[PDB]
Amino acid sequence: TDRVSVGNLRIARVLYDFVNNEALPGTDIDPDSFWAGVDKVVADLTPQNQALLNARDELQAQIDKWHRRRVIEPIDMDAYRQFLTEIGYLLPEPDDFTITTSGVDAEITTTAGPQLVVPVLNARFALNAANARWGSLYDALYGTDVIPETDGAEKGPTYNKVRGDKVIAYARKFLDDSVPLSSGSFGDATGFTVQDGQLVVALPDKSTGLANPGQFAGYTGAAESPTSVLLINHGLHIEILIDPESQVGTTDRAGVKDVILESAITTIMDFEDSVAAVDAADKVLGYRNWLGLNKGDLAARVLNRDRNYTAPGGGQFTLPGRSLMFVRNVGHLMTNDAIVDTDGSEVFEGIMDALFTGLIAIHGLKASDGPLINSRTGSIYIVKPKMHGPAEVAFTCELFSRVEDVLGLPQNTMKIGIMDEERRTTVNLKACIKAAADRVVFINTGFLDRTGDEIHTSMEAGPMVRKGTMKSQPWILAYEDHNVDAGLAAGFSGRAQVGKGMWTMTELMADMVETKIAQPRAGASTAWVPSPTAATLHALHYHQVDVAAVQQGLAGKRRATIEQLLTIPLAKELAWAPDEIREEVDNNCQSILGYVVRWVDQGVGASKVPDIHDVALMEDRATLRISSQLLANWLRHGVITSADVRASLERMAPLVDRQNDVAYRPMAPNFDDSIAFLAAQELILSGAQQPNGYTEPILHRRRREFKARAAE
Template sequence: MSQPSNANRIQKGILAIDQQLYNFIENEVLPKVGVDSDSYWSGFEKVIKEFTPRNKALLETRDKIQEQIDQWHLDNPTKNGEIDYPAYKAFLQEIGYLLPEGDDFTVSTENVDDEIAHIAGPQLVVPVRNARYALNATNARWGSLYDALYGTDVISDENGQEATGGYNPTRGAAVVAYAKEFLDEHFALASGSYSDATGFKVADGKLEVIQGDSSTALKDAEKFVGFVGEAASPTGILLKNNNLHAEIQIDGSHPVGKDDPAHIKDVLLESAITAIQDCEDSIAAVDAEEKVEVYRNWLGLMNGDLQETFEKGGKTRTRKQNPDREYTTPDGGTLILPGRSLLLIRNVGHLMQNPAILVDLGNGPEQIFEGLMDGLITPLLSLNDIKGKSALSNSRQGSMYIVKPKMHGPQEVEMANDLFNSVEDLLGLARNTLKIGIMDEERRMTVNLKEAIRQAKERVIFINTGFLDRTGDEMHTSMNAG
């Protein structure tokens, strides 16, 4: 592969940095996060010197093992379509593909946000290079149940309920009925149904649901956790079930709320609890210009100031990150809930290289390993959030969550863990501030998963199976098996 020239590059030791990337980090990042330029680039160079040969060696091991497996299958063809599995397993152990499994151990990761540690909920994956998509995913923490129902086939098109070009009141009525059945199921009343409700009020710290001349309460009073507005006439009722929230929104002047007996205009549901902002599979960022787009958007998300202006329906719209949501608790206190999904970032894996930075270790310039570059730059961009200085907080535990894809077994996880150690030292962060999500999507990872987790047991936050990658690797690894 021919390498890009050093034209329009800034030289920092063994690093030849594309001018666009260098200017972005120098002018937009380092002053904002309070890191000294010389210290950062000298530390960057040190890490690259240490980990580039190690990265290469791991990839060479991949190739060698694959060659050995291919040859074994050629030398040991199947008989009647069957592989000699005992012999195959012994061979995999001999070449170090299958590793010995050690004693049991306990994962001891600390300072993990509730969205990962305690709340079960949907997770989105979105290309961080596209600011509008990145913002949509970030803001998907809360979503309108009415809108979701109206726009999907959950509500049938039969009996005049079709989704027409304009608003269809018949379909709208079906949406409202469905939503109230949802409330009945998950936030049951002591008597009657939400379809009987004519109003809401909070008295003595308890929710009262008015039903004409009478009133009722929640069957489980603990599910009422807050409200918006005045207790006697709230504009929002916050309910909680299985660590997820729902807000009944009340507005008698709203086009939907004015026709509802209780003036319910919508039910807002806590939806995408987390979102992975992706530098890898869902985007193509093949040079410095595109990597700067990726990094600039992540910087904006971590500082709470990312916004995107676009044209839609003939109008100019600006999208930005949602603020947090504030409620009054039943005892008169204040409850603040995050307005945005907790964000993770998926760095590129160990395989890919990128011309944004050229590295010269004595044999001429070569493209930097992109996983090393991401590992050194994305935490720098996250510093204000990690230190609690962001306008809109992401991690309230002072952690950063990095998803690491396409690793082959324990040695590669060990390198990722050691890389994170070095980055933490460079940026003055406490050990294990950078958390890792291990993608289990390579066969060599799957069969050695326990030992892979052991290598990052103080910073691992999840194991996430990439089914398509996992299946593809199985086919590739076993291609000569017939």
């Protein structure tokens, strides 16, 4: 064929060659021993992987039946709770404990700041994301709606000085709020100098230093007239660039050219919900980019070097120039035919990701032909998504342990960022953390997947509230607080990240700056952003909120009950008028179609899709999971008919065709000839039958179908 036999496995040649020629050289792992290890790990752990997936199905069957066999008024919470305990869904809560994870980098244990997620299959985006550790505040302010485009302040083809002056003024207020002067305001500064190791800021009438001189972290250039001044606040760096000859510095009262913020402290290179990878060719593209990131030679533009500074006293030092990288592996569900066994059965994809992304990450622990690219403390950081409960966490740990043995790595090298994005994890979160107590480096509320699981788990209970109502429902507010509580109770402060979820409105940056501050105010040491620009703007929130102090104030508090976590988001009687149902259907169909068409026809796993209100939303599989499950639920309970669904899909499809484009194939009017349209339809009409409402089985099948037809 086009496969390589190793034991019981038949490996796609493209993957075999990539591993031997690109991934293995430089790790000192023997190629034959590696492939024997792949065979042995797959054979040994596949049964447990399948058993865990079977357990999800059996628990969900019981829950479906339970709802179908009830007539009572609102749900008897006491009966529901004891039922879930009976079936093993709700497990006992373990005694208090503190995590023991060691060898973790400061960016994770100590620094509070933004965490950027990027599809690993897009080399250009991945490079920008790794370089997003530092970003221009002026560019982020000028280029977005944070500075309103009011009369006279609009963006044009050329620089608008009125707008630029608003940018400068915004940044000066940020400096006053973050690194205050002893007296006066940065808005009146006329220059900066370093005198006896102290920062001196010239005012019109006088000179002043910092109210806290310890916030002066360094400078570049001559101490007499530095080319830049480096400050620190809440552990994050701020750099004032001084250049009176620049276009902006010429207009500035102190010659300031820009303010650079330490922004994306860590970055998650994603193999999961933001990428479309359905075969060996796709996986190799992703693995090769992850390899180039860890070897430091990925080029599309290149990775940045570390940044050199002079210390206040005069010594030299350096700061990391790149975001510390995690990789998000796929979860336990899917198989991939990149490897098949002798029976033709596909191998579990999460098992493969652990082996291959783990192998590749070794390069980030060693010098790059300069210094090693990633973890100086010797860890490999893997986000494991979509786990359901503590036995599934234990399985990830065993998989990582077995992979470490194959790779010759110390035990516990491979650390786990746990997504809390499935109900059976939420309600057993303390036990999930305990199961990974020596590997865990974060917990994070993946609230979009979590909403998808909320809908599917209770699918039989009745019609759910509209998608937009979900973000304010009791269950989700309890879930967010419960996650923070569990992390802090497990000793996460100073040891691991407590993270919150993604901002998806990529153009609504004024709204992000106004509202996303709630996440660090809730004690999250990190939260997810969709772009380098949004990382720079979200960094402002960490200068305003002292997350370390917030976490200390939250200690010992139990702010969510199990009853709150289990409050199902059922709609009340007579909740909606016909126009509101119409808008919900059309909005969900447009978002489904806009995302699925680029997935199936172009293999793009994350797309900006305008919604029914013309708001650009960054869509990935989790937002698709919500929209498809909600419509499945409304169809299941008679809120809408199958004619309503088909009509909405047919009405929104031509609009999506218009929004798109070199490789774009219109879906309309030949709907049944478009694999993408049929995939969108199947996601709704078959949604109730998909395991835990997951979208990958349909998406993968339909993308492979598209590729097959295109190859003739």
